[PDB]
Every structure is written in C-alpha cells, then in structure tokens.
Ligand binder design. Structure first.
Ligand SMILES: O=C(Nc1nc(=O)cc[nH]1)c1nccs1
Ligand SMILES: [Cl-]
Ligand SMILES: [Cl-]
Length: 163
C-alpha cells in the first residue's frame, strides 16, 4: 500500500497516466466505445480480449503486465435514477475489490457514468461520492482523471474539503 494513501485529480488523458493500473469506463460488450473507453482501446487494445462484463461489475485484463480494470457503469438513458444509482455504486465497489486483489500502490480512475452514459445530466458529485465510498477503505494512491477545467476545480475542492 501507499505510505500515506491520498486522492489527487489531474486534467488530462487517462491513457497518459503515471499510475500502476488504470480503470476503463467500459461498455458491457467490450467494444472500443467513445471518450475514455476509446482512449483506453487505442493505448491498451490487448486488454479488450474477453473484457465483456455486466453493468455494475468490473473485469480486469492485463496488457503485458499492466492491469486494465474494465468497470461498467450504467447508462442513465436506459436505467431509472434509483436503479442507475445502485449500479453505479456497485461498479465502484467492484473496482475497489480489484485494486485490492492486484496489490497495486496506485490507480488512475475516471468518473464513471459522467460522459455519454450520464443521460444528459451533471453527475460529478454523484459519481465522485460513490468513488469515495468504495475507495476510502483501500490504501492505494488514487488519481482521478477528468477533461473539463470546471470539473477539475470541483473535484479538487471536494478532495481538499475532507483533509
Ligand atoms: O467515455 C467515458 N465513459 C464511457 N465510455 C464508453 O464508451 C462506454 C461507457 N462509458 C467517460 N469519459 C469521461 C468520464 S466517463
Ligand atoms: Cl492530454
Ligand atoms: Cl470531465
């Protein structure tokens, strides 16, 4: 584990992360997808061999020795707010189990269900709070990746408020 486990946020492409493993914001079918998923497919295509997994679950596939944890958040265009909220929390709990099993000291993670699966709603606080509920009990350094300047500021404020 990390000596003083922390949370940090960076505004850049998660395919350029400086962590020991990456979480992909995957689709259930293991397809190349869009946004973060397409960036992950271009950088670690080998990790999409048998990566299909249901909504609310995570499945890790190695690219060489580098772990890619495919986490499938719900698409809020298809799910109700109550059911989608439950599956989003579940996907993050499965990421925490995989990060612990892998024994890594750091992990790069995007905010699940905040892009094309958001159903057109701002889900920064919802998704980040489920990330903290799952990852708080792990001892890996967590680095959250985002692309929007206003989101970077809001995620950074949420991390600093708890310290
Ligand atoms: O690209 C994104 N998510 C996503 N992409 C897919 O193709 C299928 C499911 N989820 C994200 N970008 C930023 C935060 S999540
Ligand atoms: Cl970049
Ligand atoms: Cl973003």
């Amino acid at each position: 584990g990390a000596m003083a486990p922390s949370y940090r946020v960076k505004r850049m492409d998660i395919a350029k992360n400086d962590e020991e493993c990456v979480v992909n914001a995957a689709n259930p079918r293991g397809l190349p997808g869009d946004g973060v998923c397409k960036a992950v497919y271009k950088k670690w295509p080998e990790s999409f061999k048998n990566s299909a997994t249901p909504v609310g679950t995570a499945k890790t596939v190695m690219c060489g020795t580098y772990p890619v944890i495919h986490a499938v958040g719900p698409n809020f265009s298809n799910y109700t707010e109550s059911e989608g909220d439950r599956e989003l929390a579940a996907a993050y709990r499965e990421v925490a189990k995989e990060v612990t099993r892998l024994g890594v000291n750091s992990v790069a993670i995007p905010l699940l269900s905040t892009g094309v699966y958001s159903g057109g709603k701002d889900r920064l606080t919802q998704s980040l709070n489920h990330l903290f509920t799952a990852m708080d009990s792990t001892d890996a350094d967590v680095v959250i990746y985002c692309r929007d300047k206003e989101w970077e500021k809001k995620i950074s404020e949420a991390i600093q408020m708890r310290t």
